[PDB]
Every structure is written in structure tokens, then in C-alpha cells.
Amino acid sequence: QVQLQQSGSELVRPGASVKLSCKASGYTFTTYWIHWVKQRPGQGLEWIGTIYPGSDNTYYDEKFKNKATLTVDTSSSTAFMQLSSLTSEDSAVYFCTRGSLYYNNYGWFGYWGQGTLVTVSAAKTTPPSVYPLAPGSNAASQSMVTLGCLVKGYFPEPVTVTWNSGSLSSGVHTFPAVLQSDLYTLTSSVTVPSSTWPSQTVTCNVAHPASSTKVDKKIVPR
Amino acid sequence: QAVVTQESALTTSPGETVTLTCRSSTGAVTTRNYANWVQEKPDHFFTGLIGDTNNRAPGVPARFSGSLIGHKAALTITGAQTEDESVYFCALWYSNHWVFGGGTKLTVLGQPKSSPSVTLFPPSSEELETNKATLVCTITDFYPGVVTVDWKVDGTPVTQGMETTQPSKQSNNKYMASSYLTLTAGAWERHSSYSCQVTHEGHTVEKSLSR
Ligand SMILES: CCCCCCCCCC(=O)CC(=O)N[C@H]1CCNC1=O
């Protein structure tokens, strides 16, 4: 019955600021420390700073000395983090967690919010530009062959790709999007046998909701 | 500004023991670094495991034990179970801040190891026609799901312009990853050797394409 509630996502524009919140319940707010932690995908955790809601004590870590500002709200028992001049580099998931009982280090990172995904961009609804991915003159005389589509420069998440609208579904692989200079990019491949291509056309179908768009791209040999 | 260092990945199988270490750039670890350890399970659920070097947190299984062996903090899991495949971060206190290690992914082997299927792709001309070029490296069907992916252009290494998705599961419970090298239409045409190198279980598999 101990619980800290973090709102899931928040999107915010480069150069602006943001104030994260952490709604603690199920325990005596005043007596336990609250810590904040940064997690960029494919990176570990990064300690930002901790606060003791009883009498305004903080320790920050040097690097976030003046990115981050930390505040309590004893009445509503919610904990706050102000982020300053938000840049691309600050797009991370942000966790708050409950620490020790009183001034001491004899406790644990006991309980963790589920985080706020802070995504920093000036992007406006862009369809994807789907380009094909053919091999290659290094000519697999062999069983199978892989071809795919780059789905570049679309925003926001997600798009969804299929191959011949589902006709071909075995051995299809779609990969995670990656954030590339304000815009997302991902890809999908699909592995067929030799005879069946370019014999029979193989197309990927790529749908992007937010732009109400949907394109198909015939994969032609090089 | 300490660098806390952990084993990058580690594999066990159920029933076995394993120890994850964590050591300080600052030399030996002291009792007063208060070494914690924290598990991260899928979907960002963290749970504290250890505090004050060897204190086990209420609820946590006796398997998990915390230590200080010579100059480094450790965490030994004794009765290793499939519940324990996870990522473990130790964290140390240095008088006025906490600093986390970069974590160890534990993999509790549940199937024979499979090596990755790398596939390099040259830029489509259509893309080139927008002043930009992107090479794509698709890694699929590997277990455990740990890889490093390095790119080389013209023999030399690249360290800015690449992106690599962290591995994800495939219906068959093996893993897949993708890597994107980006360069302008010019750059593309100024080089020749393009190479994507994927390492897995200390065996590298490489693909390169020449223009
Ligand atoms: C020998 C001097 C020690 C002074 C330490 C002052 C307490 C620092 C504030 C703090 O980080 C407390 C806390 O929340 N600790 C948690 C973090 C995970 N393990 C803990 O005990």
C-alpha cells in the first residue's frame, strides 16, 4: 500500500521548462527522502538529486546543479522536479523513488514511480518517407534473401508496417523506432526464398495514423 | 564524478550461483559508500534489493545477498531462478551524491545460444536524391540478447552518426536489433569501405559493403 504516482508522458518544446510530479501515498511523506533518476533508453540510471520533505534539504549532483530544481508539497504529499532549459539531450524517462527514514543512509531505494517519459522536440506531424532496402550485387545463389524498408522522418509515434498486407507474414522483422534530430525512424525487413523474388513483387505497406497517410513501396532489384 | 563499474552482462542457469561486482574508480569501496543494489525488471519496475552494503530489503528473497569483498561491492544470487533475469545496478554514496553503475544484465539461460544474422543495406538512390544517406544494419536471431555494434568507414571507426536500438524480443524469444549510420549525400560519395560489425559472446560477425 506504499505508492508514488508519476504521470506517464509529457511532451515539451526545446528551450522551454517542465515541472514533474510524484504523488506519494501509503506512508508518512514527511519522514522519508525522495530521489529522482534519469533514464535515457539504452543507458543506465543517472542520479539527479534527493529531497527531505521535512525541512527542505537537498543534495543535487554537480551535473544537474542548474538543470534541476527540487520541491515538496507537504499538504498534498506530492514531490516536484523543475527542469530548466530543456534540450534534446534531456529527453529521458524520469523516475522518483523513496529513500531512507530520516537523515541517514541506512535504507533503500524502496519504491519507484513508473516514470514520466519526457520527450523534447519541435516536430510537427510529418508522414514517413519510405525508402526500400534491396541487396546488393553479392548474389546469394542460396535459399533465402532479405529485403526491407526504411521508414524515415516521421512524427509522432507510431507507424505500422506490413508486407503484402499480411500475405507475407512469416519471418518479418520490424525494429524499434529511434529519435533522429526531432524525427523518428525505424525499419522492417522480411526474409523470403530466392526463386520467389524478384519473381513475385514484394511490397511493404506502411501506415502512419497521425498524418492520416499510408504508402506502399515495391521493392525493386538494384 | 566517480565511475562505478559493473560487468556489462552475465549469464547463469537456474539453480546456480552468480556474483555481480561493482567497483569504484576512486579505488577501494568503503562501508561508507553504503553500496545499494537495485533490480530493474521489464517495463521499468525497479525494486530495491540491498542497502548499507549488506542489508536485505523487506520482502526480498534470501537468495539475494549483499557483500563487500576486498575493494568491491558484490551481490550474489544463490538459488538463481528465471524470475531473476533482469538488470542490476549498484549505486554508491560519495559524501554528497549517489552515483549508479551502468548495470549488469543477467540472463538466466533458457535456450541454446544463437549467433546474430547481420544484414547491411546500402542507401536507396531515392534517399540519396534528398541530399542524405543512411546505412542500415539489421541484427536478428541471437541469444543471449546482448550485442555491441561498431561501424567503420574506410578502415577507421565511426563514433558519431550511428544509432543502435537496444535489443528486443521476437516471438521465438530470441532477440533482434537495428543500427543506423547517417551521413550526407556528399560523405557517402567520398568514402568506399563501409562496415557494420556486430559482436556477440565475444565473437564478431561483420558485414561491409563497398560503393
Ligand atoms: C557518515 C555521514 C553520513 C551522512 C548521510 C546523510 C543522508 C543522505 C541523504 C540520502 O540519500 C538518504 C537516502 O535516501 N538514502 C537511501 C538511498 C538508497 N539507500 C538509502 O539508504
Looking at domain A1-123, its CATH class is: mainly beta
Q: Could you give the CA distance from residue B120 to residue B122 in angstroms, rounded to a whole number?
A: 7
Single out the residue in B70, B85, B110 at which a domain terminates: B110
Q: Where in chain A is the domain with CATH 2.60.40.10?
A: 1-123, 124-222
Single out the residue in B51, B75, B110 at which a domain terminates: B110
Nearest ligand 1 atom to alpha carbon B93: 11
Q: In this structure, are B104 and B128 located in the same domain?
A: no
Please name the residue that has the C-alpha cell 561491409: B208
Q: Could you give the CA distance from residue B19 to residue A157 in angstroms, rounded to a whole number?
A: 39
Q: Could you give the CA distance from residue B159 to residue B192 in angstroms, rounded to a whole number?
A: 18
Q: In this structure, are B105 and B131 located in the same domain?
A: no
Q: In this structure, are B93 and B133 located in the same domain?
A: no
**Shortest Cα distance, chain A CAs vs residue B156, angstroms:** 23
Side chain identity, residue B93:
W
Whether A104 is in the pocket of ligand 1, judged by its Cβ within 6 Å, is yes
Q: How many CA atoms lie within 13 A of B11 on its CB side?
A: 11
Q: Could you give the CA distance from residue A161 to residue A217 in angstroms, rounded to a whole number?
A: 11
Q: Could you give the CA distance from residue A4 to residue A20 in angstroms, rounded to a whole number?
A: 13
C-alpha cell at A182: 526531432
A124-222 CATH fold: Immunoglobulin-like (2.60.40)
Residues of B in contact with A169 (CB under 8 A): none
For residues B107 and B50, is the Cβ–Cβ distance under 8 A? Answer: no
Side chain identity, residue A127:
P
Nearest ligand 1 atom to alpha carbon B51: 19
Nearest ligand 1 atom to alpha carbon B91: 18
Whether A50 is in the pocket of ligand 1, judged by its Cβ within 6 Å, is yes
**Shortest Cα distance, chain B CAs vs residue A42, angstroms:** 6
Q: In this structure, are B142 and B203 located in the same domain?
A: yes
What secondary structure letter does DSSP report for A184? E
Q: With CA atoms as reference, report the closest residue to A50 among A3, A107, A97.
A: A97
Q: Is A35 one of the annotated binding-site residues?
A: no
Q: In this structure, are B152 and B72 located in the same domain?
A: no
Q: In this structure, are B121 and B172 located in the same domain?
A: yes
Task: Find residue B157's DSSP bridge partners.
Answer: B152
Strand arrangement of the beta sheet that strand B72-77 belongs to: B4-6, B18-24, B72-77, B64-69
For residues B90 and B4, is the Cβ–Cβ distance under 8 A? Answer: yes
Residues in chain B: 211
**Torsion region of B159: left, alpha or beta (phi above 0 gives left; psi -120 to 50 gives alpha):** alpha
Provide CB contacts within 8 A for A28, sequence distance 6+: none
Q: In this structure, are B36 and B140 located in the same domain?
A: no
- State whether A109 and B48 contact (CB < 8 Å): yes
Question: Where in the sequence is the domain holding B117, given as residue range(s)?
Answer: 111-211
C-alpha cell at B71: 575493494
Q: In this structure, are B124 and B202 located in the same domain?
A: yes
Provide CB contacts within 8 A for B145, sequence distance 6+: B107, B167, B169, B174, B175
Task: Find residue A92's DSSP bridge partners.
Answer: A118
CATH number, domain with residue B20 = 2.60.40.10
Q: In this structure, are B75 and B146 located in the same domain?
A: no
The 3 state secondary structure assigned to chain B is CCCEEECCEEEECCCCCEEEEEEECCECCCHHHCCEEEEEECCCEEEEEEECCCEECCCCCCCEEEEEECCEEEEEECCCCHHHCEEEEEEEECCCCEEECCCEEEEECCCCCECCECCEECCCHHHHCCCEEEEEEEEEEEECCCCEEEEEECCEECCCCEEECCCEECCCCCEEEEEEEEEEHHHHHHCCEEEEEEEECCEEEEEEEEC
Resolution (A): 3.2
- State whether B180 and A97 contact (CB < 8 Å): no
From first CA to last CA, the distance across chain A in angstroms is 61
Q: In this structure, are B81 and B132 located in the same domain?
A: no
Q: Could you give the CA distance from residue A133 to residue B123 in angstroms, rounded to a whole number?
A: 7
Residue B186 has phi, psi (to 5 degrees) of: -55, -65
When divided into structural domains, chain B yields a total of: 2
For residues B114 and A124, is the Cβ–Cβ distance under 8 A? Answer: no
Q: In this structure, are B67 and B133 located in the same domain?
A: no
Whether A33 is in the pocket of ligand 1, judged by its Cβ within 6 Å, is yes
Which contacts of A160-168 are long-range, i.e. CB under 8 A and separated by 24 or more positions? A160/A206, A160/A207, A161/A188, A161/A204, A161/A205, A161/A206, A161/A207, A162/A204, A162/A205, A163/A188, A163/A190, A163/A202, A163/A203, A163/A204, A163/A205, A164/A202, A164/A203, A164/A205, A165/A205, A168/A192, A168/A202
Best mutation site among A131, A149, A183, A219 for testing chain B: the one with the most B CBs within 10 Å? A131
Single out the residue in B52, B78, B110 at which a domain terminates: B110
